Structures are given as C-alpha cells and as structure tokens.
C-alpha cells in the first residue's frame, strides 16, 4: 500500500478507539476550534455590543458573570448577516467588541455537528448496521440550526441568534414569545408533546423492562449483575411486561412486538422535535402562533377577554421592555 | 432517489431564501415587501414624517448616541438607523433614488423625496411579512382586525419545511441504499456478526 | 462515536427510569419553594455591581427588565381583584415601543 | 464583585465530600480479591 492508501485505511479503520472517518476529518478540527474558542471566550472575553447600539453586554466569567449569567454573546446588529471572520477586523480588540467569537464558534460548531451526523451514518456502514441513528440525531441538529442559523437569516442578523449561555438562552426564549407567540404555535406544541412524551415513554419503557427482569441474582447484590454483556438470551420477560401494561390500560394499547415498541420510542420524540425545529425555522419568517386577541366579543361589541388576551398582556410586557434603547420607530419589524 | 432527494432539499432551502430576500424575480408589487424592505420602509416613513415637522435628520442623535434616522454601516455607508441597521444591504426601486456614492444622500433626502416614495414606504411598512397562523396581520401582540399573512412568509415557511423533510428523506434513503447494496438492510447475520470478528477496543 | 456506550441492558433501562423521574421530582421541589415566593430571582452580587455601575450589563440584568415589563403589563388584567390602575406614565417601556 | 463569602467553601465541600466518598468506595473495591 502507498501512503494515501494507508492513510485511507487508518481514517476509515473500524479499530480506532474513536472512529475518525471522512466526516470526522472535517468534524475533528471544526469542533476543536469551536470548543477552544468557546472556552476561552466564556472565561475571558470582554463585553460585546450585541445590539449594535454601543451598549456592550458582558458575557465572560472574568468580567462579572457566573456560570448561570455567563455567555458568549451574539455578534453585533451592525454586522447583521455579514460574515465577520477574524481577518475582517482591524484588530482582535475590534473583533472582540463586535462579537466575532460568536460567529467563529457557531459556524465551526454547525459544520462539526453536521459532520457528527454524517459520521454516525459512516460508522454504521463500516459495522454492517442499519443506517438511521443519524436520522434520529437530525432532530436536535435541526434544532441547533434553527436557533443559530435559520432564525438569524429570517430576521436579518446573527445578533438575534440564541446566545451561547444559560441566561442568554432564556432571553432568546422570552423575546421569541413576545415576537412570535410561540406558545400558541402548533409546531411548538407538537415539540412539547415530543419532549414530555419522550420523557413519559422513556420512564415507561425503563420501568416496564426493569419490572420484568428475570431473577438471576440474590438480594445482597445489584440485579444488574444478572445481565452479562453480549449474552444471547433476553434479560427480561416481554410477555410479562406486555401482560402487565396491557392490563394497566387494555390489551391492544400495549406493544407485544419489541421492534414496533422501539420504533415508536425512536419516532415519537424525533418527529415532535422535528416539528419544534420547524416551528423556530418558520417563525424565522414570521409565520407566528395563533392570534386570538379580542376574538370574543359581546352583543354590543365589548371585548370579552379569554386566556389568549392575558397571554397577550404578558407578551406586551416582554415586547415593550426588550432591548430598551434599540428601537426608534413604533413597530418592531425584525 | 436519495441523490435527487438531497438535490431537491438543497433547492428547497435556496427557494426559501430567494422568496425571503429577492425582490427582482419576486416583485414586491406581487409578493409584498421583503422583511428587510418593510423594516427599511418604516425608518423611511418616520424620517419623512419628522423631517416634515422640522427635524434635521442628519444631525439627530438617538438615545444610544447613534443617529436616530441615519448612521454609518461598518464600512461607512450612510444607512437607516435603529434596528434596521441590520438591513442596510436592502435595495429597492423606491429607495434607490435617494442613494449616492456614499450611501443614503442627505441632500437628496432633504429635497428629493417624492410622494410616490412616501406612499410606497408607508404601504410596505404596514404590510411587513409578520402575521399569525390564523392570518391575523402584524406583530404577535396585535389585535384581530387585519386578515394578512405575506405570500413571502407562506412561501418561505412551506419550502423550509419541505426542504427539511427532504433532507431527512435523503439521509433515510441514502443510508438504506448503502445498506441494501452491501446486503445488511434487514439486520445483522447472527452467524456472521461483523463486530464479533473485530478486535476489542480495549 | 461518542466515547462511551452502555454495556449493561439492565443499567440502561434503569437509567431510562431514573433520568426523567428524577428531573420531574426536582422541578416539584422548586415549585414548593415558589409556593412561598422563595425564588431564585436574583444574584445579589450582580445587583450590587449594576446598581453602582450603569455600564455593567449581562443577559441576567436584561431578563429582569423583561420580567418587570411582564409584571406591569399583565397584572391589572391578570389579577383583577387587586383593582390595579397603572397610569400610562408609570408603565415601564423602552424607546419607541 | 460582592459574592457570598461562604460560596467558596460551600462549593469546595459540595464537590470534595461526595467525590471522596466515591473514590474511597472505588479503591477498596479494586483492592478486593480477583
């Protein structure tokens, strides 16, 4: 074998402790750059003029933040969707003021995480597996694309991308509610059904398999020792599990087929989260939640408030207060 | 099929961006103003209003220190101020006559704005592509009254959803085509499990 | 792919019980605190700094401004027994909006 | 910044006490007969 042939054999080797592969050739450097920049920025970055109004917001630990308040702050509204790599700045000091780290991080991250998804297909192929784990990962990935790329595109600025920080995330959520009434949007509602249901079914499946473990141990040892890695025989009794759950509800509401059950476990959260991602990605173009403001009116024409109108009052509070020095004109159009 | 699904997905996302930003092959006369367009149109509207009242819009300093109506882009071009600073790359027939070599021209702004420009900016500002799923026009806190969602929003959202699911279909079918070609799409052969012939990782 | 993996099916399935169940139990404890208004509302160090230094801003201080808007704008209709009348002039608002 | 002056010891013991409990248990497991 020549050098290229050998290199290819190593890259695609099924024997590396962590699989590299061709997607990994892009994933490794991009994820390392994003990680390193993030860590350094989160600790040490100076304040960033997120809203382009010369009002710098401090995100880093050394500049007065704790783990909860800290963030890498989105790039300046003055930049908008302009590409702002380090070399476009006159200095690192300028780059930092304008939120250059945010763009470097999210672009390397999105590239790296897309390659992470490809890499999941890639290894499944090398191991002779079925290929669709990567399709499940497309759900959180799509969600990351929605908040870091698609929303900024629709609104015309990376300053409206989700901040890389715990409190910045909450800021993004509250402002999103004000501007899109996301709670009243059916795609976010499907998302909630996806994650509440995902958690429910996770607990359900956990509890049912755990409930029907076949006795292989004594009381002075963990029942976990009753299962040996790679054993051929199933470790629980699915017939007893189905016997239980089918009586809890009724026979035909319970799965007796493990393949069907596990497919449902994959599908429910993944589809819901795809809708969550699509909610963000379509509210990115301002097709917003249901608006029933003043929908109910009496015989004279008096407005009779519903809970939708109370939501509206909360939303107004968010709207009027957010970015309190950034608006000069009466309508918030992006 | 998978190759075509990948291609159509790509095209879907491109079409989404085309209808969101482009006002040439998607004329605003027919599709409504773009998001960038309507935001710029708002700044234009109030510049006109306040200048009619006697404001000197070039020297008017906003609360932040940036110009209330007019400021510089990061490369120095004169652009509208407030949040629409992000939209300074917007270009449209109603705005361009006010543009000089250095961006928005203050002498043109002071002297050359025509009633058709005021009308257009007012029209576009009040038909911004924001609206609810039940087609209540305007911001999310707006009251029922105006039955409006921009065709630009309908076309961008639908095509994002379609492009996204087509990427999923691409992955589904590309991964399946690979597995079927190699002969393991139905599962692992119990008597020939590949991992069992591989050395342990540790 | 990830560096680690399950090797024990019994552990895997117990963990699937543990995680969402423990999460829900934790959220419940927080709500018990909120019954008493015993909130995590503030970071005191943040407030002391921001009160003395009008250039100090974090996403934490930004979210409190949003909260203050929510409270003032929603309370009169959301809490009708209080008979709140907040004149236009007292309502917290940023510029223009 | 005007932080709570007990936050440092609170955090350090919060980490060290249970971490140490686990390390003690782990090491004495390892030292048991194979």
């Amino acid at each position: 074998a020549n050098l290229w042939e050998r290199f290819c054999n190593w890259v695609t080797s099924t024997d590396n402790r962590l699989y590299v592969g061709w997607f990994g050739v892009i994933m490794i450097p991009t994820l390392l750059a994003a990680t390193i920049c993030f860590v350094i920025a989160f600790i040490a970055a100076p304040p960033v003029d997120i809203d382009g109004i010369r009002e710098p917001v401090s995100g880093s630990l050394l500049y007065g933040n704790n783990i909860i308040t800290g963030a890498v702050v989105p790039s300046s509204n003055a930049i908008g969707l302009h590409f702002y790599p380090i070399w476009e700045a006159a200095s690192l000091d300028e780059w930092l003021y304008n939120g250059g780290p945010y763009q470097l991080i999210i672009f390397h991250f999105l590239l790296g995480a897309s390659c992470y998804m490809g890499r999941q297909w890639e290894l499944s192929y090398r191991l002779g597996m079925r290929p669709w784990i990567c399709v499940a990962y497309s759900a959180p990935l799509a969600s990351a694309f929605a908040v870091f790329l698609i929303y900024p595109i629709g609104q015309g600025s990376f300053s409206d991308g989700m901040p890389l920080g715990i409190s910045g995330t909450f800021n993004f959520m509250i402002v999103f509610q004000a501007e899109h009434n996301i709670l009243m949007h059916p795609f976010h509602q499907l998302g909630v059904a996806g994650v509440f249901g995902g958690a429910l079914f996770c607990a359900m499946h956990g509890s049912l398999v755990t409930s029907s473990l076949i006795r292989e141990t004594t009381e002075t040892e963990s029942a976990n020792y009753g299962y040996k890695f790679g054993q051929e025989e199933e470790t629980y009794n699915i017939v007893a599990a189905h016997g239980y759950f089918g009586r809890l509800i009724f026979q035909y509401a319970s799965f007796n087929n493990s393949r069907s059950l596990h497919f449902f476990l994959a599908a429910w959260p993944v589809v819901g989260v795809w809708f969550a991602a699509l909610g963000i990605s379509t509210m990115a173009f301002n097709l917003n939640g249901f608006n029933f403001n003043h929908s109910v009116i009496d015989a004279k024409g008096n407005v009779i408030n519903t809970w939708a109108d109370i939501i509206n009052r909360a939303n107004l509070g968010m709207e009027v207060m957010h970015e309190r020095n950034a608006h000069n004109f009466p309508l918030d159009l992006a | 099929l998978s190759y075509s699904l990948g291609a159509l997905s790509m095209m879907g996302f491109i079409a989404t961006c085309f209808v969101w930003f482009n006002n040439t092959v998607y004329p605003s006369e027919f599709y409504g103003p773009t998001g960038p367009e309507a935001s710029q149109a708002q700044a234009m509207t109030f510049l006109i209003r306040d200048q009619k009242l006697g404001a000197n819009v070039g020297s008017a300093q906003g609360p932040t220190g940036l110009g209330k109506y007019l400021m510089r882009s990061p490369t120095g071009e004169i652009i509208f101020g407030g949040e629409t600073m992000r939209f300074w790359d917007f270009r449209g027939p109603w705005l361009e006559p006010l543009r000089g070599p250095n961006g928005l021209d203050l002498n043109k702004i002071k002297n050359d704005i025509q009633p058709w420009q005021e009308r257009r900016a007012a029209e576009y500002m009040t038909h911004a592509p924001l609206g609810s799923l039940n087609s209540v026009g305007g911001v999310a806190t707006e009251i029922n009254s105006v039955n409006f969602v921009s065709p630009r929003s309908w076309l961008a959202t639908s095509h994002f959803v379609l492009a996204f699911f087509f990427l999923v279909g691409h992955l589904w079918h590309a991964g399946r085509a690979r597995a079927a070609a190699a002969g393991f799409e139905k599962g692992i052969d119990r008597e020939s499990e590949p991992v069992l012939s591989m050395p342990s990782l540790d | 792919i990830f560096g680690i993996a399950f090797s024990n099916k019994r552990w895997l399935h117990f963990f699937m019980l543990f995680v969402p169940v423990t999460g829900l139990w934790m959220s419940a404890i927080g709500v018990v605190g909120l019954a008493l208004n015993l909130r995590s509302y503030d970071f005191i160090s943040q407030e002391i700094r921001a009160a003395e230094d009008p250039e100090f801003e974090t996403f934490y201080t930004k979210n409190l401004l949003l909260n203050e808007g929510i409270r003032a704008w929603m309370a009169p209709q959301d809490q009708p027994h209080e008979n709140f009348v907040f004149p236009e002039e007292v309502l917290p608002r940023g510029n223009a909006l | 910044m005007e932080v709570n002056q007990l936050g440092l010891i609170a955090t350090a013991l919060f980490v060290l006490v249970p971490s140490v409990f686990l390390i003690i248990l782990y090491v004495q497991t390892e030292s048991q007969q194979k």
């Binding site: 054993q231 | - | 680690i4 | 980490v15």
Partner: peptide
Amino acid sequence: METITYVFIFACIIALFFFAIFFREPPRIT
C-alpha cells in the same frame, strides 16, 4: 475566587470525560 471555582469545576469535568472514555472498565463478552 468565584471564577477560579467555576473554571476548576469545569476542568475537573473535562478530566473526568478523559478518564471515563480512555480509562473506562472495558466491556467484555462473557
């Protein structure tokens, strides 16, 4: 002191990742 604490905990977690991956008990088929 707070910053030191936060970074210290983070650094311990990263070290933990390293040991949990490269120095895990190996899975063995019985």
